[PDB]
Amino acid sequence: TFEIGEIVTGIYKTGKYIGEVTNSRPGSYVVKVLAVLKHPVQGFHERRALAFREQTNIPEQMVKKYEGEIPDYTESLKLALETQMNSFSEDDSPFAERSLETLQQLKKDYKL
Amino acid sequence: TFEIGEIVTGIYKTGKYIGEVTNSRPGSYVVKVLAVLKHPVQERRALAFREQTNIPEQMVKKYEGEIPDYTESLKLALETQMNSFSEDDSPFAERSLETLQQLKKDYKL
Fold first, then answer.
1. Can the keyword Kinase be found in this entry's annotation (chain B) (predicted)?
2. By C-alpha distance, which of A19, A91, A15 is closest to A55?
3. Going from the N-terminus, what domains does chain A have, and what CATH number goes with each?
């Protein structure tokens, strides 16, 4: 169980975020996004991270109490993206190729 | 009247912080500290990450910017305050700078 105002991590569409619980309901929480921990998987269309202060419904199983520091949203997004891009370093698949292309553009779209 | 969960700034003992309202009473808010905007004037330590503080309602404001990383924000706020003494040859500058330089070590940077 999580109370309003509680700082949590949330997993949404393969992305992972730090956020704040702003409402509860049967089986889920509305989470206000504050930072990005993991940029979502792509695929061939792009898939954007949740935006700063975006509020999204997340099933309760995918929500966890978070007591760490809250990173700056923009710097966290920059980091999350570089991490995902680097994750393909030893990957010679077509999926890696297509993903890396996609993330490179997203990086420009985000203003980073 | 800020609601519980509201992201705010609070000014407390000359320091300025970004935080979250966790409680409310007439004329005051309990604020949980998430980042430092301004290191307090000088001995006088910044509020700790996740420290909960009672702040007079007049000194609390809705905050809509990004929440910076606490340690990064403390490092910046301390640097800014030390840099503010550039060209200042006064004893107050000297004493403050000494105290801040120690604080930097206490904070473990």
1. yes
2. A19
3. 1-112 (2.30.30.430)
Nearest residue to A12 via CA among A57, A52, A43, A47: A57
Most A CBs within 10 Å: which of B17, B37, B64, B69, as the mutation test of the A interface?
B69
Contact B70, B35 (CB under 8 A): yes
Identify which of A4, A35, A67 has the shortest CB distance to residue B5.
A4
Nearest C-alpha neighbor of B58 from the set B26, B34, B17, B19: B26
What Å resolution does this PDB entry report?
Answer: 2.0
Which residues on chain A are in Cβ contact (under 8 Å) with B49?
69
With an 8 Å Cβ cutoff, is A34 touching chain B?
yes
Burial zone of B3 (CB within 10 Å; 0-12 exposed, 13-18 middle, 19+ buried)? exposed
Place of tokens 């792509």: A42
Cβ distance A72 to B70 less than 8 Å, yes or no, reads no
Distance CA A33, CA A111 (A): 18
